[PDB]
Symmetry: D2
Subunit: 347 residues, 4 copies
């Protein structure tokens, strides 16, 4: 007794859901996707990410629980599988006086300490230090492809205009029993879905060779509500990602030079160890610039079943700026919605 | 214990670092300007198809390196699907403008009879070779190095000797292996005047034709070729191509792209649905790399430069993946030789 | 009773901004600064004008505002084509096909050498076809030519970026606060402070620029390749190259040319007017220069030309020209001049 | 009627076409791959600043051409504002870390800076008025001038120079081809000039108007990096430079080089930004890279019978194609006229 599943999409959400589904021997799985790991394109968010684990959800929220559920998997991969491109990094988070002390992730993440009042920079209300992970997305996304392959997942280049078409793309040559929709921001335009609550949150990055040795971030800036500051160093020499930008309803794919300059200035002033004692922006050794669009949904991630044109579909999209840090938690819930959808299909 | 900096993180660098990492007396840093995940004109490896299609003559250095590399690639395609290499049926058509040595090497080798060969075609070979999804394989190689304790660092060097100061131990490296490819033309203390780019333009499509096919030449020009190959694990199909010596142009030419796409659908029509032309190709993107061609082929040899022992492994032209393990095995041999003198 | 002066800032340097600047400059009473983020010679998705074909081929209903602006614009364009070859406009023979899937249009009484194509001559699946002489603008010559025409009349051009329309009033070259600002920011009026026009939307248009000169302009009213895909061609004056189109994708901001869209544009164009290539050739006979994508500044109510007081500054809008900014330019610029003269009456 | 094909539409071709067009016995086709409005690394002209800042020795071919060029540029700036040429105040700083030039006798209000006027680390400095060309207005303006005189323009790619003689708008084989292909003369058939080489120049285009052209003799960032700025006429933007990299063909702007251009420029002339601002004070339009067509012997202006066609070359202008444009064009016309007999 087998189930033909097409996972539509090959970003974090598609790859993590396909991998977890593949652990069930009754699932025969095709990952069908327009863009694959190795691709850089504005329609494909996953490779643009930093990425790190830095919870943004409230303790009792859906997102918060998803973040909480994801950590043990990411820690497991970081501890046991150096081939996956995940490493542990010391992390500092600064919260400005113009604004949260002792967050829930303090009980979860290793080496959590709250910094003393005399250790705080001017303008900072509270700060904390802890161990978390930075994901080298360029190594990790193909690692997930690889893990899916070991469990017999077949990958296939495809483009669909409507979600129900994905059910005709299963490698068996037979109709899929279920389609899992991990199209992210493309679910805004995809037929049978057309989710109007989706919006891009544009994110510009500068990729640099300089290794500061820790992840840094501040709660806000004085450059505007949509210009943020963070940095993280990717595992396995992948480079340092300097950010950033959070521009809702902005679709612009091309790095803006002014914005790039301001990210770099904000970064070298937040964590000066990026550069030598005397230096400004010129001591950064830039690899490239980049821009992705965060698939922000009004109510956050949509993980639910829907019978669409006589095809059972389990959605798993709308992960905004937290798709990696919710990935395993979200994929797990999706695995259960798939089970539930097939259980209704069986009877 | 030997503090080795591998300068470079393309196929040559990664494959050599991996073979070196098998020796526990080696402490290995990979230091490089560009890493897997990067697309840049200075970084050839991501631009490759890539496949195994020998170009060296039987008893040439290149030929023996190609011969030595096959069992490594076969084993990876057989036993490690996570690496992004799979077996593919291959066709090689030879025009007018037979029994090649790889016929005794590659599985399922047959030569085509004249009743099967189209007009203007002299002879053809059919066989099983491999296609490498380089987007998966390059990071896989990073991962295998990582699993063996290899440390990866982002670095830029003006001079080859500087790499000896980038070792992750903090101590001065005993040896630097120069795996900088085409950058060894300008690299301090190497400055190799016999290196030239052979520009290669590609078209990346979603269409899976089920096989690799290539021809010995085209009517579109001396420097224009036809090949296609489908990458493993849904990596896409690579349509080629171009071999343009002393051409450094990083940008895809729209005219060359259309010609690539025209020649490919004519060579192997199963790329497209019956009666479709170029519009039938679902195009992912275009691409351009520069092959690091060297006149005397790959340079693998030891040299004392500014106190630092240097073993070069560069100048692999269009055949860096298909000589990777073979060249890296020679590099290891020369590394042990240079360390014994030390 | 001193020399009467009006300090005007024209905000924007695309066709709307430039044509309106030029018309205002012919009044010696006006002292004019053109302040703009992008200028002729720049390529950017925020700047629609250099992406245009561009031709004259009316889309407005006879008695509609757009239609009347189109009619008013032809004389100016024809005169420039007639008398000023330096401007990069030339006349070209033009054919339009109206398919059976979708007859004596008003421009038949305006444009020279017009004819209805016969019952015998209409190709399969076409209800009506018309041939006529119109104009093709080499935008890469014409936009800088308009800059030059403004400069002759002492218009000062200044690079500037504003978050709010009122800030343009502080950008006048005289050092004094502007009396009026002309808002010609096209699609950027969606986001610009004090304007925030939610009725603006992009209509993405992708082109292929080629070397091949068919010696005529030709379009069709629709295609088999979807509602958002169209077919046209025009050859720019003065060796400017041939523009192959196209695409009309509402609510699509994508700045990058899609290679599949490019191939289909070229396939359709090869079909519609075969003398692009030497017969026996397909797409490979085209000598491609480059690909290009622009976003047409579509407004639901068409072009906004009205006076508004935003903060202390009188503002005259002239934006929302969609895919017809060149063929309405002089018509629209004339109305704005009159609205400016209206607001200055105080 | 002399049927002339001018092969190429950068400064060399356009200026030469315009000069030849003033003789009514010439029927001229400008045939070119790339035309004004295009951006491509095979097309050098739109990547230029451009300004007049002579580099040739007093009695050299180049310096003579620079000298003869000035009055043409001065005149266009004086009487023809529509052409996008700008009079600009100019300062040239010579570092002590790295002399009364001949152009002191050519350019208006030239004066050496006094001892009190020299900044720290500066040996001597020259102040004068020169010209900045808005290449984006001026190139199309030249096309327009050619058009007014009956020059017809044709998009065309040729693999061999002699083929250009078949592209004449009359339909008859051209009496003469003018080779104005710049760096493309290295690969173009019948020419294949191996003394050509690229000198790569990266620029930053900014909105900030400093009010003057600033230039310095050298850098602390290595020989192949330079420092200059110039503001284009008619709101064309300010061009920040730069680099001079022999044999580098690279078309992509390198971000580290860009950052260093911007720092050197705000340090050379701080009125680019406001006091307190660094590189964030610069309002960037875009980055760009062109390849100067450097030739060993400088510009090649001579007749050559290639196949059955008379070819007058005018290429290899390096970083001085604009400031020698008219000088060189005039000589080419003389060479053309002779070749017709
Ligand atoms: C600058 C930036 C930094 C970020 N940093 C972090 C971080 O530090 N931590 C974190 O957790 N998150 C981060 N994110 C967010 C994270 O990148 C996203 O939430 C995540 O990538 C969403 O992945 P996805 O699989 O849902 O969508 P995608 O990555 O967009 O994948 C969608 C898949 O569906 C395919 N597809 C879409 N439509 C079709 C179709 N019609 N037919 C066939 N295939 C289709 C696409 O090709 C693709 O394979 C960041 C995002 C940005 C932009
Ligand atoms: C279109 C195309 C198709 C191809 N197809 C095939 C194929 O089918 N089969 C096949 O076998 N081969 C193929 N090749 C050839 C293959 O890509 C090359 O032979 C191979 O990638 C060269 O590898 P490399 O590691 O030696 O050099 P590279 O891949 O160029 O790596 C060089 C490394 O050195 C680093 N580096 C350089 N300079 C410095 C510096 N100064 N400081 C620090 N680091 C530096 C770079 O950042 C990089 O990490 C193809 C090539 C092209 C262009
Ligand atoms: C592919 C394509 C083909 C077309 N073909 C034709 C055709 O054949 N015929 C025709 O009539 N039309 C055609 N069009 C339409 C035409 O391009 C537009 O209608 C016209 O360009 C709009 O001009 P504009 O000056 O109003 O806007 P723009 O060209 O975008 O000019 C806006 C100006 O405002 C400036 N600006 C904006 N915001 C700010 C700010 N905040 N601060 C400072 N400056 C700012 C911009 O930099 C720019 O200088 C075509 C369009 C496309 C996309
Ligand atoms: C960053 C930078 C700054 C500069 N600043 C200055 C400055 O301040 N002052 C100054 O004087 N100079 C400056 N220069 C130099 C100047 O830009 C060049 O010297 C000049 O533009 C060369 O013009 P050209 O017409 O000879 O060559 P191009 O501009 O390259 O034109 C060559 C023409 O030939 C055509 N062509 C080539 N091959 C073929 C073919 N095979 N078939 C058909 N057509 C062909 C091309 O398409 C083109 O139309 C600068 C250059 C750079 C890169």
């Amino acid at each position: 007794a087998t189930n033909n599943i097409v996972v539509l999409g090959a970003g974090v959400s598609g790859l993590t859901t396909a991998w977890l589904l593949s652990k069930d021997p009754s699932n025969k799985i095709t990952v069908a996707a327009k863009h694959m790991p190795g691709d850089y394109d504005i329609e494909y968010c996953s490779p643009w990410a930093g990425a790190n684990y830095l919870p943004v959800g409230a303790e009792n929220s859906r997102v918060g629980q998803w973040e909480r559920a994801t950590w043990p998997h990411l820690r497991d991969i970081a501890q046991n599988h150096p081939e996956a491109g995940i490493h542990f990094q010391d992390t500092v988070v600064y919260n400005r006086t113009k604004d949260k002390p002792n967050p829930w992730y303090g009980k979860v993440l290793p080496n959590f300490r709250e910094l003393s009042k005399d250790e705080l920079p001017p303008g900072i209300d509270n700060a904390n230090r802890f161990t978390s992970v930075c994901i080298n997305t360029a190594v990790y996304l193909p690692w997930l492809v690889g893990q899916c392959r070991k469990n017999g997942v077949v990958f296939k280049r495809a483009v669909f205009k409507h979600v129900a078409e994905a059910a005709n793309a299963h490698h068996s040559g037979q109709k899929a029993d279920l389609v899992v929709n991990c199209t992210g921001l493309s679910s805004r335009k995809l037929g049978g879905v057309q989710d109007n609550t989706l919006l891009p949150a544009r994110g510009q990055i500068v990729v640099v060779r300089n290794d500061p040795g820790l992840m840094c971030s501040i709660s806000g800036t004085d450059d505007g509500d949509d210009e943020v500051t963070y940095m993280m160093t990717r595992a396995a020499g992948g480079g340092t990602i300097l950010g950033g930008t959070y521009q809702k309803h902005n679709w612009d794919s091309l790095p803006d030079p002014n914005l790039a300059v301001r990210i770099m200035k904000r970064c070298i002033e937040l964590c000066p160890s990026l550069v030598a004692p005397g230096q400004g922006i010129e001591g950064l050794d830039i690899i490239r610039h980049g821009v992705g669009l965060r698939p922000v949904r009004e109510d956050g991630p949509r993980i639910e079943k829907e019978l669409i044109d006589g095809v059972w579909v389990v959605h798993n999209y709308g992960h905004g700026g937290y798709g990696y840090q919710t990935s395993f938690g979200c994929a797990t819930t999706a695995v259960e919605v798939v089970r539930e959808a097939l259980q209704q299909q069986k009877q």
